[PDB]
């Protein structure tokens, strides 16, 4: 029966990950998944399943999964928890409180860490309204807060909404880049296709 898998390694090993503000949303469907090894790796610094549990997970088929993926400095993976607050939650990535899936996060300070300032990685900093479940504000109009709009000028009350991390090699432990993959297991009303082994 087992012949193929979902192209999980195409992110669980991918060369670069998105800035969390523009977090990639790799849609996964039309495949099967041996989720256990996606968990039994002893390499992840975090794997928490919400609305589901790692037990019996391989029985779980879904219409699809929406593997959201990005990079955030290690500790702040805690804002990846449904109903959490925080800048990733408030302004970069909102997990619905009624989430049904899993979250994966590992260190990558060997890979996504470089001197000189890696402007590869970015996150939103100023924003009018809080976010929505699985919504992505890649667009980058420059925020305003008080009397005047910004005209395209950035100054006081006028700041570029995205700032970087700068994963310096000499960073502290709490500063390390966790690559994060959020496997949202969606079962709307379509055929369930992303099944488990056997």
């Amino acid at each position, epitope marked *: 029966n087992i012949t193929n898998l979902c192209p999980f390694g195409e992110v669980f090993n991918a060369t670069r990950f998105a800035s969390v503000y*523009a977090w990639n949303r790799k849609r996964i469907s039309n495949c099967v998944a041996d989720y256990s090894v996606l968990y039994n790796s002893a390499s992840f610094s975090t794997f928490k399943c919400y609305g589901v549990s790692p037990t019996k997970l391989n029985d779980l088929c879904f219409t699809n999964v929406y593997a959201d993926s990005f990079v955030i400095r290690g500790d702040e993976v805690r804002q990846i928890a449904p109903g959490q607050t925080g800048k990733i939650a408030d302004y970069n990535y909102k997990l619905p409180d009624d989430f049904t899936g899993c979250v994966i996060a590992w260190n990558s300070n060997n890979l996504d860490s470089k001197v000189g300032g890696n402007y590869n990685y970015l996150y939103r900093l100023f924003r009018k309204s809080n976010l929505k479940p699985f919504e992505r504000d890649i667009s980058t109009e420059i925020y305003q807060a008080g009397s005047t709009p910004c005209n395209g000028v950035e100054g006081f009350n006028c700041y570029f909404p995205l700032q*970087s991390y700068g994963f310096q090699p000499t960073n502290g432990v709490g500063y390390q880049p966790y690559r994060v993959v959020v496997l949202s297991f969606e079962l709307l009303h379509a055929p369930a296709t992303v099944c488990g082994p056997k």
Partner: antibody, heavy 130, light 107 residues
Framework: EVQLVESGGGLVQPGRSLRLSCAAS????????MHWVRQAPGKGLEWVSG???????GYADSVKGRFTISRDNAKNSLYLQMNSLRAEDTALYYC????????????????????????WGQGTMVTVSS | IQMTQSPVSLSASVGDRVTITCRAS??????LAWYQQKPGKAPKLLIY???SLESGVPSRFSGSGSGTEFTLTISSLQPDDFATYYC?????????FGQGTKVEIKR
């Protein structure tokens, strides 16, 4: 045809921001890693920035930060938010798609391709005037 | 690193066999692509990997070399090819292109 069309280009004051577009067509824009490559007036081509199938690549040296690539596979339109445009960024910017199938590149294989940029968009001219 | 053609320009009438060579600033493996860019239009792809061929070009083009120096040659020639030509590098993004030698063939 397998075509690129870019917009948002014209006279812009020095340092004033601007956002391009590249409403690519045909090819699975969800796979190949775009790049914005600017040709000076008459002079050579020159890589400005790139972006992987998911996101994130370096830029040219004097253009990091002040530029910001981005895309949206769910819409088919690469972006380029340009900020603090200096004198030299006056050029014609071409959208371009990397040569190889960068859907799921190798995790750990010593490659770092640089034989790319197959299809070039028509190019959206950009000036810097006072 | 860098990638600079050896000629600066050249004219050599139709029906001629000519070479254009690009030398590096360091060992750039062996990946390279070649661009002919007619005046005012969008550059085109000619050779990838510094040797192979891609479907969509007449076979008259040829590429060889490795390491630091590479070469692109045109043997049987047509009116169209009168155009600018560019190399590039790969080692590490950014991978630039280089000066670009013209070809204004007519003598």
């Amino acid at each position: 045809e397998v075509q690129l069309v870019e917009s948002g280009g014209g006279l812009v004051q020095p340092g004033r921001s601007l956002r391009l577009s590249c409403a690519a067509s045909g090819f699975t824009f969800d796979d190949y890693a775009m790049h914005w490559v600017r040709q000076a007036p008459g002079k050579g081509l020159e890589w400005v920035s790139g972006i992987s199938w998911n996101s994130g690549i370096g830029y040219a040296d004097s253009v990091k930060g002040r530029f910001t690539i981005s895309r949206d596979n769910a819409k088919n339109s690469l972006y380029l938010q340009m900020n603090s445009l200096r004198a030299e960024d006056t050029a014609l910017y071409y959208c371009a798609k990397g040569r190889p199938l960068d859907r799921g590149r190798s995790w750990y294989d010593e490659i770092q391709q640089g034989d790319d940029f197959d299809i070039w968009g028509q190019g959206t001219m950009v000036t810097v005037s006072s | 690193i860098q990638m600079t053609q050896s000629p600066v320009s050249l004219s050599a009438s139709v029906g001629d066999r000519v070479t254009i060579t690009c030398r590096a600033s360091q060992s750039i493996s062996s990946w390279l692509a070649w661009y002919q860019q007619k005046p005012g239009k969008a550059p085109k792809l000619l050779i990838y990997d510094a040797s192979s061929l891609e479907s969509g070009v007449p076979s008259r083009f040829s590429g060889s070399g490795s390491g630091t120096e590479f070469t692109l040659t045109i043997s049987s020639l047509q009116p169209d090819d009168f155009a600018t030509y560019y190399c590039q590098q790969y080692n590490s993004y950014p991978g630039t292109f280089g000066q670009g030698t013209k070809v204004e063939i007519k003598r």
